[PDB]
Amino acid sequence: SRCTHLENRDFVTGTQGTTRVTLVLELGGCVTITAEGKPSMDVWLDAIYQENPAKTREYCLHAKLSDTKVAARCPTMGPATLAEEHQGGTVCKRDQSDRGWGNHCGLFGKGSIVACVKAACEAKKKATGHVYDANKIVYTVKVEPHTGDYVAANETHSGRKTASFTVSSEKTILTMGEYGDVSLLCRVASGVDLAQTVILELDKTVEHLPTAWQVHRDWFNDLALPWKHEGAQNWNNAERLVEFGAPHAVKMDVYNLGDQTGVLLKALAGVPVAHIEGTKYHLKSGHVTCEVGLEKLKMKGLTYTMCDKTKFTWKRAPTDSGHDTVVMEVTFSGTKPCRIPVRAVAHGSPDVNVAMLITPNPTIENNGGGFIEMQLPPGDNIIYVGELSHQWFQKGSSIGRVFQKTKKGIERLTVIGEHAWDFGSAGGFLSSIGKAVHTVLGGAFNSIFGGVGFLPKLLLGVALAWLGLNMRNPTMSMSFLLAGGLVLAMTLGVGA
Amino acid sequence: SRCTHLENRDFVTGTQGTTRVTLVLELGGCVTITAEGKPSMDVWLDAIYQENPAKTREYCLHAKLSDTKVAARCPTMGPATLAEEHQGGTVCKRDQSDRGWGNHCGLFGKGSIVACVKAACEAKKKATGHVYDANKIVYTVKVEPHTGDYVAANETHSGRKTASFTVSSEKTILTMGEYGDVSLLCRVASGVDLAQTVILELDKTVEHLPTAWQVHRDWFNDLALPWKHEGAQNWNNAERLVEFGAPHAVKMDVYNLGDQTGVLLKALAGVPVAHIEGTKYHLKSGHVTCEVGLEKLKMKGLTYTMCDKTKFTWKRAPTDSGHDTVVMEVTFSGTKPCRIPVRAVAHGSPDVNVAMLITPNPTIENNGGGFIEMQLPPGDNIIYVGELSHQWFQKGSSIGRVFQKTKKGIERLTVIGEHAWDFGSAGGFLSSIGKAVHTVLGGAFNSIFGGVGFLPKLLLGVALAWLGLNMRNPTMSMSFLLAGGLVLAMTLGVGA
Amino acid sequence: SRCTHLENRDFVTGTQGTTRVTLVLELGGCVTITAEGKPSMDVWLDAIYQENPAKTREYCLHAKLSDTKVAARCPTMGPATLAEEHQGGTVCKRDQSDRGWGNHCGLFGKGSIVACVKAACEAKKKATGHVYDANKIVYTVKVEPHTGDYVAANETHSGRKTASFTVSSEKTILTMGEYGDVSLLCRVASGVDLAQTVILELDKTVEHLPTAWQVHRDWFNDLALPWKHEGAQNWNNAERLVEFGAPHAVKMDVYNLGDQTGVLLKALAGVPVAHIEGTKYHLKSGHVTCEVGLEKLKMKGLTYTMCDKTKFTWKRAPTDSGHDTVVMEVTFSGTKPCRIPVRAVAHGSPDVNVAMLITPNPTIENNGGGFIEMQLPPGDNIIYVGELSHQWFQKGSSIGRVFQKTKKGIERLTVIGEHAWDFGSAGGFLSSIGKAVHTVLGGAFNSIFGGVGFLPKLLLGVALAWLGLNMRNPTMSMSFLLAGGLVLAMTLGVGA
Amino acid sequence: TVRKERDGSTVIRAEGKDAATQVRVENGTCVILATDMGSWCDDSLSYECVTIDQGEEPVDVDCFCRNVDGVYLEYGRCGKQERTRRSVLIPSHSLRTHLTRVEGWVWKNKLLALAMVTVVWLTLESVVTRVAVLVVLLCLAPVY
Amino acid sequence: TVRKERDGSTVIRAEGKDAATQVRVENGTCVILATDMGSWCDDSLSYECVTIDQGEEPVDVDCFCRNVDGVYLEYGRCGKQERTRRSVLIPSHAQGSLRTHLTRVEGWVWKNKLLALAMVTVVWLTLESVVTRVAVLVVLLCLAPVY
Amino acid sequence: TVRKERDGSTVIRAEGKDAATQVRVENGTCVILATDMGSWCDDSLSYECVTIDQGEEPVDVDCFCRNVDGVYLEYGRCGKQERTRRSVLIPSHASLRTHLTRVEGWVWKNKLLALAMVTVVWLTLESVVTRVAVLVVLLCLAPV
Ligand SMILES: *[C@@H]1O[C@H](CO)[C@@H](O)[C@H](O)[C@H]1NC(C)=O
Ligand SMILES: *[C@@H]1O[C@H](CO)[C@@H](O)[C@H](O)[C@H]1NC(C)=O
Ligand SMILES: *[C@@H]1O[C@H](CO)[C@@H](O)[C@H](O)[C@H]1NC(C)=O
- Domain shared by B379 and B334, yes or no: yes
Using DSSP's 3-state secondary structure scheme, residue C266 falls into helix
Dist. CA D56–CA C489, nearest whole Å = 92
- Strands B63-73 and E39-48, by their bridges, are parallel
Q: How far is CA F76 from CA A250, C166, D46, F37, in A?
A: 30, 57, 39, 6
Q: Looking at the structure, do residues C414 and C465 belong to the same domain, yes or no? A: yes
Residue C310 half-sphere exposure toward CB, CA atoms < 13 A = 5
Is the CB of E95 less than 8 angstroms away from the CB of B271? Answer: yes
Q: Read off φ and ψ for residue B454, nearest 5 degrees.
A: -85, -55
User: For residue B444, with 0-12 CB atoms within 10 Å meaning exposed, 13-18 middle and 19 or more buried, which class applies?
Assistant: middle
Residues of E in contact with F29 (CB under 8 A): none
- With contacts defined as CB-CB under 8 Å, which chain B residues touch D59? 108
C46 in Cβ contact with C288 (< 8 Å) = no
Query: CA B309: distance to chain centroid?
Result: 47
Looking at the DSSP bridge assignments, the partners of residue B138 are B49
Are B302 and B361 within 8 A, CB to CB? yes
Q: Where are the alpha helices (DSSP H) in A32-127?
A: none
Q: Which helix (H) or strand (E) holds E2?
A: strand E2-4
E84 interaction partners in chain C (CB closer than 8 Å): 246
CA nearest ligand 1 atom 2, residue: A155
Burial E72-105 (b: 16+ CB within 10 A, else e): bbbbbbeebeeeeeeeeebeebeeeeeeeeeeee
Please report, as a single letter, which amino acid is at residue A334.
G
**Whether the Cβ atoms of residue C152 and residue C4 lie closer than 8 Å to each other:** yes
Question: Got the DSSP string for A231-270?
Answer: T--S-BTGGGSEEE----SS---EEE----HHHHHHHTTT
Phi, psi for A155 (deg, rounded to 5): -75, 170
Query: How many CB atoms are closer than 10 A to CB A477?
Result: 12
Position in ligand 3 atom list of the atom nearest CA C153: 14
One-letter amino acid for residue B4 of the chain: T
**Gap between the Cα atoms of B250 and B113, Å rounded:** 7
Gap between the Cα atoms of C353 and B21, Å rounded: 131
Strand partners, B129: B57, B200
Of E59, E62, E83, the CB nearest to B256: E83
Residue nearest to atom 8 of ligand 2 (CA): B154
Q: What's the CA gap between A355 and B253, in Å, rounded?
A: 95
From its phi and psi, is residue A451 left (phi > 0), alpha (psi between -120 and 50) or beta?
Answer: left
Whether the Cβ atoms of residue A9 and residue A29 lie closer than 8 Å to each other: yes
The conformation of residue B62, written as its DSSP 8-state character, comes to S
Q: Which method was it determined by? A: cryo-EM
Same domain, C392 and C450: no
Using a CB–CB cutoff of 8 Å, tell me whether C77 touches chain F.
no
Report the number of secondary-structure helices (H) and strands (E) in chain E: 3, 7
Name the strand (E) or helix (H) holding C70.
strand C63-73
Helix (H, G, I), strand (E, B) or coil at C406: helix
Q: Are residues A317 and A391 in the same domain?
A: yes
Residues 19-78 of D with CB under 8 A from A: 36, 42-53, 56-62
The identity of residue C202, as a single letter, is: L
Hey, what long-range contacts does B393-400 have (CB within 8 A, 24 or more apart)? B394/B326, B395/B320, B396/B324, B398/B447, B398/B448
Which stretches does DSSP call E strand in B52-137? 54-60, 63-73, 90-97, 111-121, 126-131
The C-alpha atoms of residue E75 and residue E46 are separated, in whole angstroms, by: 7
The size of the A-D interface in CB pairs under 8 A is: 100
d(CA B114, CA B250): 9
Closest-lying ligand 2 atom to the alpha carbon of residue B154: 1
User: Which of the 8 DSSP states describes residue B191?
Assistant: P
* H-assigned helices in B140-200: none
The rounded distance, in Å, linking the Cα atoms of A240 and D88 is 8
**Alpha-carbon distances, residue B82 vs A147, A467, B129, B215, C366 (angstroms):** 75, 99, 35, 42, 96
For residue A158, how far is its CA from the centre of ligand 1 (angstroms)?
A: 14
Q: Are B473 and B421 in contact (CB under 8 A)?
A: no
| Gyration radius of chain E over CA positions | 40
Q: Specify the DSSP class assigned to residue B172.
A: -
Minimal-distance CA residue to ligand 3 atom 4: C155
Q: Is the CB of A155 under 6 A from ligand 1?
A: yes
**Buried residues in C310-340 as b, exposed as e (16+ CB within 10 A):** eebeeeeeeeebebbbbbbbbebeeeebbbb
How far apart CA B333 and CA B387 sit, in angstroms, is 13
Cα→Cα distances A117→A208, A243, B417, C106, Å: 36, 11, 84, 67
Contact at CB, C249 and F59, closer than 8 angstroms: yes
Contacts of F35 in chain E (CB under 8 A): 33, 58-62
Helix (H, G, I), strand (E, B) or coil at A44: coil
Q: How far is CA C496 from CA C176, C447, C449, C487, C488, in A?
A: 31, 11, 8, 13, 14
For residue A16, give how far its alpha carbon lies from the nearest alpha carbon of chain D (Å).
36
Task: Return the residue of A nearest to B110 by Cα.
Answer: A246
For residue A434, give every residue at least 6 positions away whose Cβ sits within 8 Å of its Cβ, in sequence order, or none.
A488
**CB atoms B106 and D59 under 8 Å:** no
CA distance C43 to C162: 10
> How big is the E-F interface in CB pairs under 8 Å?
41
List the residue whose alpha carbon is closest to atom 3 of ligand 2: B155
Q: Which residues have C-beta within 8 Å of that of residue C407, sequence separation ≥ 6?
A: none
Residue B54, strand partner residues? B131
Which residue, B119, B114, B116, is CA-closest to B257?
A: B119
Tell me which of F81, F84, F85 to substitute to probe the interface with B (most B C-beta atoms closer than 10 Å). Answer: F81
- The rounded Å distance from CA C150 to ligand 3 centre is 13
Alpha carbon distances (Å) from C361 to A412, C343, E110: 99, 12, 84
For residue B325, give the CATH number of its domain. 2.60.40.350
Q: Is the CB of C209 under 6 A from ligand 3?
A: no
Please give the backbone phi and psi of residue B440, each rounded to the nearest 5 degrees, phi first. -65, -45
Exposure string over C367-376, b if 16+ CB within 10 A, otherwise e: eebbbbbbbb
Ligand 1 center–CA A27 separation, angstroms:
21
Q: How far apart are CA B194 and CA C306, in angstroms?
A: 118
User: What is the length of chain D?
Assistant: 144
DSSP H helices, C254-329, are 261-267
Distance from C-alpha of B439 to C-alpha of B487, rounded to nearest angstrom: 14
Q: Which residues contact A168 (CB under 8 A, 6 or more apart)?
A: A135
Using DSSP, state whether A479 is helix, strand or coil. helix
Alpha helices in A21-127 (DSSP H): none
Amino acid residing at D118: T
Query: With an 8 Å Cβ cutoff, are D35 and B74 in contact?
Result: yes
Residue partners of B53: CB distance under 8 A and separation at least 6: B130, B131, B132, B133, B199, B281
**Residue B155: CB within 6 Å of ligand 2?**
yes
Both A328 and A381 in a single domain?
yes
What is the chain F residue with the closest CA to B248? F36
* Pocket lining: A154 vs ligand 1, CB cutoff 6 Å: yes
Ligand showing the shortest atom-to-Cα distance for residue C152: 3
Angle E113-126/E130-143 helices, nearest 10 degrees?
A: 150
* Alpha-carbon span A180 to A104, nearest angstrom: 97
Beta bridge partners of D90: none
Q: CB contact, 8 Å: B108 with chain F?
A: yes
**Is there an atom of ligand 1 within 6 Å of A156 CB?**
yes
Q: Same domain for A391 and A407? A: no
Q: In what order do the strands lie in the sheet with E2-4?
A: B90-97, B111-121, B63-73, E39-48, E71-78, E10-14, E2-4
Q: Are A114 and A70 in contact (CB under 8 A)?
A: yes
Q: Report the distance separating Cα C101 and Cα F86, nearest Å.
A: 36
Residues of D in contact with A224 (CB under 8 A): 88-90
**Mutation test of ligand 2: which of B150, B151, B154, B158 has the most ligand atoms closer than 8 Å to its C-beta?**
B154
Does an H or E element contain C277, and which?
A: strand C276-277
Q: Is B245 on the interface with F (CB under 8 A)?
A: no
The length of chain A, given as a count of residues: 496
Asked if A67 lies within 8 A of D49 by C-beta distance, the reply is no
From residue B350, alpha-carbon distances to B310, B344, B347, B376 in Å are 19, 10, 9, 16
Which alpha helices (DSSP H) does C363-454 contain, by range? Answer: 398-415, 426-441
What is the CA(B297)–ligand 1 centre distance, in A?
Answer: 85
CB contact under 8 A, B268 and E56: no
Whole-angstrom Cα distance, residue A167 to residue D116?
52
Q: With beta carbons less than 8 A apart as the criterion, state whether B235 and B226 touch.
A: yes
Q: In chain F, which residues are last before a break of more than 2.5 Å from C to the next N?
A: 82, 94
**Chain B residue at shortest CA distance from A245:** B76
Full domain range(s) for residue C444 = 399-493
Distance from the alpha carbon of residue B154 to the mean position of ligand 2, in angstroms: 6
Which of C78, C91, C105 is closest to C249 using CA atoms?
A: C105
The shortest C-alpha distance from D51 to chain A (Å) reads: 6
CA distances to A456, B78, C127, C198, E7 from C57, in Å: 116, 48, 9, 10, 65
Beta strands in A325-387 (DSSP E): 326-327, 330-332, 338-339, 342-346, 356-357, 363-364, 373-375, 379-385
- B441 and B455, same domain (yes or no): yes
- Residue B262 in contact with residue B139, Cβ under 8 Å? no
CA distance C413 to C438: 11
DSSP assignment of A134-153 = TTT-EEEEEE------S---
* D70 CB neighbour count, 10 Å cutoff: 16
Residues in chain A followed by a break, C to N above 2.5 angstroms: none
Closest chain B residue to the Cα of A244, Cα to Cα: B76
Q: Are F109 and F102 in contact (CB under 8 A)?
A: no
Least CA distance to A249: which residue of chain B?
B107
F42 contact residues in C (CB cutoff 8 A): 64, 66-67
B244 close to B68: Cβ distance less than 8 angstroms: no
Q: What is the dihedral of CA C304, C305, C309, C315, to 10 degrees?
A: 20
- 3-class DSSP state for residue A377? coil
Query: Closest approach of chain B CAs to the CA of D33, in angstroms?
Result: 6
Separation CA D66–CA D52 (nearest Å): 6
Q: If we measure between CA atoms, which residue out of B365, B494, B363, B364 comes closest to residue B439? A: B494
Chain F residues with CB-CB distance to E under 8 A?
Answer: 16-20, 31, 33, 35-36, 57-62, 64, 80
Domains along chain F with CATH numbers: 2-78 (2.60.260.50), 96-140 (1.10.8.970)
Specify the CATH number for the domain of residue A466: 1.20.1280.260
C156 lines ligand 3 (CB under 6 A): no
The Cα–Cα gap between D49 and D9 comes to: 11
Q: How far is the CA of B458 from the centre of ligand 1 (A)?
A: 94
**Spatial CB neighbours of C250, under 8 Å, sequence gap ≥ 6:** C70, C72, C97, C103, C113, F47, F48, F49, F50, F61, F63
Same domain, C420 and C350: no
